[PDB]
Coordinates of C-alpha atoms in Angstrom, one line a residue:
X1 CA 0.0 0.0 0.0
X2 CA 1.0 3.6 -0.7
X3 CA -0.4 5.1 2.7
X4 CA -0.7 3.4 5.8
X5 CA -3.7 3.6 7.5
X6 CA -2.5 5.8 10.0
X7 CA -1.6 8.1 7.2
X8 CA -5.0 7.4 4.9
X9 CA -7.4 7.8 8.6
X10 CA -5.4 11.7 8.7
X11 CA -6.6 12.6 6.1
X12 CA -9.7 11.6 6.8
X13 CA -10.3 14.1 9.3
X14 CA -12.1 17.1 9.3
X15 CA -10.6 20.1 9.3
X16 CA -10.0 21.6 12.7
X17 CA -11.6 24.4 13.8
X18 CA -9.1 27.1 15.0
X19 CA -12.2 29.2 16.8
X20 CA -14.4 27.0 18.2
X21 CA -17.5 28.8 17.7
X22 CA -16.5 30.3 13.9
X23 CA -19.3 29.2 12.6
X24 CA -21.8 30.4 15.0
X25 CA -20.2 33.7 15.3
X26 CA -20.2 34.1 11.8
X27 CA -23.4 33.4 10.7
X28 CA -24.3 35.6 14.2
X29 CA -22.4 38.9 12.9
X30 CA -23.8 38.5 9.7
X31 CA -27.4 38.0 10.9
X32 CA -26.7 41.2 13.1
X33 CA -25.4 43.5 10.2
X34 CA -29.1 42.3 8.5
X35 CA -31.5 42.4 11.8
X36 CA -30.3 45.9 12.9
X37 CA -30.9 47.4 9.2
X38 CA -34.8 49.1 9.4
X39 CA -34.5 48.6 5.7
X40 CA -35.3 44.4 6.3
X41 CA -37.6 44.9 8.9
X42 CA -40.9 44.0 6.8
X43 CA -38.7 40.8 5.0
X44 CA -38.5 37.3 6.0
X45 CA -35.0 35.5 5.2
X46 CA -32.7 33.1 6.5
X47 CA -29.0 32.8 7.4
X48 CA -27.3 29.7 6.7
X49 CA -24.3 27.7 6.1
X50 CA -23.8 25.9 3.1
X51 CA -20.8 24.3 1.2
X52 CA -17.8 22.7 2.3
X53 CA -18.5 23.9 6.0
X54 CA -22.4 22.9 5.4
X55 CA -21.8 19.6 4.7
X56 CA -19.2 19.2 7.1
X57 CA -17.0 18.3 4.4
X58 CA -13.9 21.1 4.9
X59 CA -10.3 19.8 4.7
X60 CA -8.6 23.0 5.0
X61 CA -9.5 24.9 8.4
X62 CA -7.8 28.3 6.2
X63 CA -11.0 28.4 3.6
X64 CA -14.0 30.8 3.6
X65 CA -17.1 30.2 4.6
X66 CA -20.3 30.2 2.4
X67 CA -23.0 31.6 3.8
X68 CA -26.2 31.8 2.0
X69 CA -28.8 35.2 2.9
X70 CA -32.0 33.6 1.6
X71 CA -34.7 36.0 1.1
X72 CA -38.6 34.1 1.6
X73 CA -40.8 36.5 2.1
X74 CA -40.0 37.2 -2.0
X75 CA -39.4 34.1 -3.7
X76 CA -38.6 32.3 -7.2
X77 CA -40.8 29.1 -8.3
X78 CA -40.8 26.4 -10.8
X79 CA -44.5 25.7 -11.4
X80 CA -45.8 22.3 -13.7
X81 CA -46.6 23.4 -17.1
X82 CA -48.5 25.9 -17.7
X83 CA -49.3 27.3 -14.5
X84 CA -48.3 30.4 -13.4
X85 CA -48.0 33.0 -10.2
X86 CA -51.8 33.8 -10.6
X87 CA -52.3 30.2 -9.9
X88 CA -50.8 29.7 -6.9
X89 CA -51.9 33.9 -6.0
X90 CA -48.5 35.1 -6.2
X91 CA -47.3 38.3 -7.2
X92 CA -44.3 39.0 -9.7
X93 CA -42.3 39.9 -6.3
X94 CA -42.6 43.2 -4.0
X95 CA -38.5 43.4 -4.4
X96 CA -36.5 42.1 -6.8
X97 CA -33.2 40.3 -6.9
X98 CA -31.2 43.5 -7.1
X99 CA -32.6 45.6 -5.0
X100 CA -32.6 43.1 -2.3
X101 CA -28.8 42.8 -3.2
X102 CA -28.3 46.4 -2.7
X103 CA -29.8 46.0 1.0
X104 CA -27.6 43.3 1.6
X105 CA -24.7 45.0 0.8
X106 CA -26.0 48.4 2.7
X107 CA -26.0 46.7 5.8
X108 CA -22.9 44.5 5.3
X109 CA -20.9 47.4 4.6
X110 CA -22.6 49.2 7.8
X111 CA -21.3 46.5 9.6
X112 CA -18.2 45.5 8.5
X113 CA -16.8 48.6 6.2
X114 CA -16.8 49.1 3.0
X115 CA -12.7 48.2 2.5
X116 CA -14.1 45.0 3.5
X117 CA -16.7 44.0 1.4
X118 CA -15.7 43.2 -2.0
X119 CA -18.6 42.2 -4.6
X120 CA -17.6 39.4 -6.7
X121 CA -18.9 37.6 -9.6
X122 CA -20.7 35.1 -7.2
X123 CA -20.8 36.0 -3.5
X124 CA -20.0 39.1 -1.7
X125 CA -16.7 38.6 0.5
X126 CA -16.2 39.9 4.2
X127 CA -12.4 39.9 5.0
X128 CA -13.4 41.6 8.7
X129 CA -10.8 41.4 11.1
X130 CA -12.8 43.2 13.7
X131 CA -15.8 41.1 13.8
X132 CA -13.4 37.8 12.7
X133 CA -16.0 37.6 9.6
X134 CA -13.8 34.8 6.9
X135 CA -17.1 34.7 4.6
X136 CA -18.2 34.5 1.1
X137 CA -22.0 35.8 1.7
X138 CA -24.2 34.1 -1.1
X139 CA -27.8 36.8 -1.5
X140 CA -30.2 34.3 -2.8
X141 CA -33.9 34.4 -2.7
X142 CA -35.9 30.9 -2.0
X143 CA -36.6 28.8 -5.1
X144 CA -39.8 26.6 -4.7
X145 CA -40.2 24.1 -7.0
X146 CA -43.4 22.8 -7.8
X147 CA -42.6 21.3 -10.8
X148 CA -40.4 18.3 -9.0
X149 CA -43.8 16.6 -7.8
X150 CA -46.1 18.4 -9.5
X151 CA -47.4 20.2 -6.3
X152 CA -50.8 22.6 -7.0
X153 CA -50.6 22.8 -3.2
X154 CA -49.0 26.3 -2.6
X155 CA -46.6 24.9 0.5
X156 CA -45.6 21.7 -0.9
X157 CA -42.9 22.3 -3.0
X158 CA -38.9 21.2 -3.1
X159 CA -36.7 24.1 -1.4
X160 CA -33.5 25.4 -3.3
X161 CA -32.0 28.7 -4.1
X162 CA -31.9 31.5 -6.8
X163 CA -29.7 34.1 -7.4
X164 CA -27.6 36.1 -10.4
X165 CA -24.0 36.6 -10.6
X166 CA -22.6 39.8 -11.6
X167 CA -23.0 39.2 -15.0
X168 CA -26.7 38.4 -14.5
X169 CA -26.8 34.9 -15.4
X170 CA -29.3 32.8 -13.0
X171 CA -27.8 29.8 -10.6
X172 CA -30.2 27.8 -9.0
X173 CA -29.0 25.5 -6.6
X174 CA -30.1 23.1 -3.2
X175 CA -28.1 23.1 -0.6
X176 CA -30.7 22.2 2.2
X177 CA -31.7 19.2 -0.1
X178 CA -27.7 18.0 -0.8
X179 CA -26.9 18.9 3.4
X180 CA -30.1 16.7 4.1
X181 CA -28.7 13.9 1.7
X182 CA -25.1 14.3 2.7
X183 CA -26.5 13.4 6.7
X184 CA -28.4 10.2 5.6
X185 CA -25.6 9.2 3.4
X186 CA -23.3 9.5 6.2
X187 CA -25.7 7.9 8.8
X188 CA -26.2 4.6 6.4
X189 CA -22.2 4.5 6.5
X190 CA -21.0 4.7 9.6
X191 CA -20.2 8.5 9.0
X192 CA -17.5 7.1 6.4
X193 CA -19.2 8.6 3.4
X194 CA -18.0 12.1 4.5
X195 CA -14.6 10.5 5.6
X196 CA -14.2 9.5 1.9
X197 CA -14.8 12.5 0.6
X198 CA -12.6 14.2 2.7
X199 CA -9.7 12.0 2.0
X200 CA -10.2 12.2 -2.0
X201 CA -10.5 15.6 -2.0
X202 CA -7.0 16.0 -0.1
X203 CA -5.5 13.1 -2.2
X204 CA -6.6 15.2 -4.8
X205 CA -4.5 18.1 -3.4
X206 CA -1.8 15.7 -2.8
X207 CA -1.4 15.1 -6.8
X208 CA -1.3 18.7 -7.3
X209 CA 1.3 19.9 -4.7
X210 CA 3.0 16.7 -6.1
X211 CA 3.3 17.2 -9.3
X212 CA 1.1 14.0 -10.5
X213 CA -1.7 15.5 -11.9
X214 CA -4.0 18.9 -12.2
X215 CA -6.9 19.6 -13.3
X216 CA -8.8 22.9 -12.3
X217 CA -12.2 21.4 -13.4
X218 CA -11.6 18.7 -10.5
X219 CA -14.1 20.7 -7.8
X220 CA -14.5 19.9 -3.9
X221 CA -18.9 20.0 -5.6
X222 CA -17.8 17.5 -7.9
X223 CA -15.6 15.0 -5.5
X224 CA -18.4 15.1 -2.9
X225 CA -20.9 14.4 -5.5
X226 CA -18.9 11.3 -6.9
X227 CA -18.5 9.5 -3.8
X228 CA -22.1 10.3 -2.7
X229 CA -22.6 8.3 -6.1
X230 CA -20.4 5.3 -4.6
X231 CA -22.7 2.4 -3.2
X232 CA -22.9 2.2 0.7
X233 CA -21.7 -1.5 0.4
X234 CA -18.3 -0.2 -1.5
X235 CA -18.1 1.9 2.0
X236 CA -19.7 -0.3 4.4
X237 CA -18.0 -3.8 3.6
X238 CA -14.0 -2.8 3.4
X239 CA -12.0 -3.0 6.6
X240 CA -9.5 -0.5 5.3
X241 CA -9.1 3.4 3.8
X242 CA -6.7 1.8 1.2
X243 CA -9.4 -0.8 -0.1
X244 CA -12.5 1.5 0.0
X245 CA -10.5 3.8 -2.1
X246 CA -9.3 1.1 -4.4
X247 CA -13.0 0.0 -5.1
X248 CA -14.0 3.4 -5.0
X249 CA -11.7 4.1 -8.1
X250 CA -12.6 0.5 -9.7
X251 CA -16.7 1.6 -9.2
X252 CA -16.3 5.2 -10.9
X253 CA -14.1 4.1 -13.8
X254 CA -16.7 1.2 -14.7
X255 CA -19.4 3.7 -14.4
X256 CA -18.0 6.4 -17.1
X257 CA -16.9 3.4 -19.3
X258 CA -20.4 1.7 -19.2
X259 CA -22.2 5.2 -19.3
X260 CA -24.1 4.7 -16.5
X261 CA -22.8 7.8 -15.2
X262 CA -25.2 10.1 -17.1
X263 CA -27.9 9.1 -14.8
X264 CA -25.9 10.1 -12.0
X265 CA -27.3 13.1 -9.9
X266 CA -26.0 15.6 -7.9
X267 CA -25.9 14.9 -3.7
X268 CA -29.4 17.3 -4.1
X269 CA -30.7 14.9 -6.8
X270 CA -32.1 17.9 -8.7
X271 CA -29.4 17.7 -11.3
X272 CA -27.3 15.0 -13.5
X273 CA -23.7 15.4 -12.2
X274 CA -22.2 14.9 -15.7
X275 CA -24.0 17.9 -18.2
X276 CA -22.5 19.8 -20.7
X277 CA -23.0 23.1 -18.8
X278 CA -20.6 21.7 -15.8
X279 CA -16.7 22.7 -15.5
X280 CA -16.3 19.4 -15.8
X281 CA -16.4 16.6 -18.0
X282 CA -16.8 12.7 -17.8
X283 CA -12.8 12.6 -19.0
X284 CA -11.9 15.0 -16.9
X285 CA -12.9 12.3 -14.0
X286 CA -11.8 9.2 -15.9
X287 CA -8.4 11.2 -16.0
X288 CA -8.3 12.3 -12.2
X289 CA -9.4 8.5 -11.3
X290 CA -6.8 7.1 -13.5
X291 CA -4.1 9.6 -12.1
X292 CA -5.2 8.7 -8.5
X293 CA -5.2 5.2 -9.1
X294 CA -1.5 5.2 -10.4
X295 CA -0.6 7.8 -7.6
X296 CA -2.1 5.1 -5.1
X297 CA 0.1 2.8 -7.1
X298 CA -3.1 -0.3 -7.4
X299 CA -0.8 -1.2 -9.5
X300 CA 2.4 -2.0 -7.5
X301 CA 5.3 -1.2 -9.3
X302 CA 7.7 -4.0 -10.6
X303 CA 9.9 -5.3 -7.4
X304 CA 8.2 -2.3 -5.4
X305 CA 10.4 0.0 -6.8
X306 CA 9.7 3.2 -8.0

């Protein structure tokens, strides 16, 4: 074996947390720079973790948060063909995505300055030393989604997100539905599912710092979503890191080859993983399988030598 287990177990781990109560403090602040602004005080939202930190999945205790501000009292909806807001008895929205943008970043910069908010393409940064604020801030409004299964009820419907980027292109996503997913993964595997992604995604880092193999389309998204793809008994019936990685590798590669892969979703199950709108592509993962499987040298080399 490569690793031992000692080594393999590591970097399992998850990231420690250098303040134990960042995550409460953050979302805290940020919830008090939006609570405190009169300019909310008729709006319903939420503030909530999502990503890496979300889904309990951060390797590096150094990364920034994402924290989603989900407006609800305004909202986005997917209705079943042809319906429409009138059917349900919505309005077109009392505020719309920019405005409620522009109030977000009013009372972030009220709180935290405006030095140290930066608006990028997809999430507002806070770099506040003051408040110890390490956040990419996500303005969203609620996405209910009727169409999923076909709902005429107005409160049944499947919970995601909406928002634009700075150039005004739409991202809908579910974080809530992937987080709940993620948790019931992890409780059907002995809390190994998360373990494996952790250790692929650092493997992954491994091969970069290493020299073995890159490949920027290669995302901490994607990794997660493969292994939530990998069978619980590929997790569950292994008595070692180094073999459920082996099978892990063995699974994925005989799923691109035998195309079974395109009916892969994402951990949220509201998307296909493999599209042509992702960064990535299905050889970009054959390639980053093949590359860990030689970096794990499966293959031992001749006379275990190099």
């Amino acid at each position: 074996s490569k690793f031992s287990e000692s080594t393999l177990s590591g970097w399992t781990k998850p990231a420690s947390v250098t303040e134990e109560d960042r995550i409460e403090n953050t979302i805290s602040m940020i919830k008090s720079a939006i609570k405190n602004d009169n300019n909310f005080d008729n709006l319903v939202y939420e503030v909530f973790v999502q990503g890496s930190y979300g889904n309990n999945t951060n390797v590096r205790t150094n990364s920034d948060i994402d924290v989603n501000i989900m407006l609800t009292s305004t909202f986005y909806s997917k209705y079943p063909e042809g319906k429409t807001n009138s059917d349900y008895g919505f309005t077109d929205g009392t505020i719309t995505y920019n405005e409620y943008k522009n109030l977000i970043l009013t009372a972030l910069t009220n709180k935290f300055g405006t030095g140290n908010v930066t608006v990028g393409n997809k999430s507002i940064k806070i770099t506040s030393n003051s408040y110890r604020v390490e956040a990419d801030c996500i303005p969203s409004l609620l996405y209910r989604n009727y169409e999923y299964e076909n709902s005429s009820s107005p409160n049944n419907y499947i919970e995601g997100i909406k928002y634009f980027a700075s150039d005004n292109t739409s991202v809908v996503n579910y974080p809530k539905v992937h987080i709940n997913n993620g948790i019931e993964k992890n409780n059907q595997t002995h809390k190994n599912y998360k373990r494996l992604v952790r250790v692929i995604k650092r493997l992954r880092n491994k091969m970069t710092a290493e020299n073995h193999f890159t490949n920027e389309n290669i995302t901490s998204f994607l990794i997660e979503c493969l292994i939530w793809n990998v069978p619980n008994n590929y997790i569950n019936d292994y008595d070692t890191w180094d073999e459920t990685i082996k099978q892990t590798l063995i699974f994925i590669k005989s799923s691109i080859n035998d195309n079974s892969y395109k009916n892969w979703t994402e951990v949220s199950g509201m998307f296909y993983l493999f599209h042509n709108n992702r960064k990535w592509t299905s050889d970009d993962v054959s390639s980053f399988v093949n590359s860990l499987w030689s970096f794990m040298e499966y293959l031992e080399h001749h006379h275990h030598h190099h």
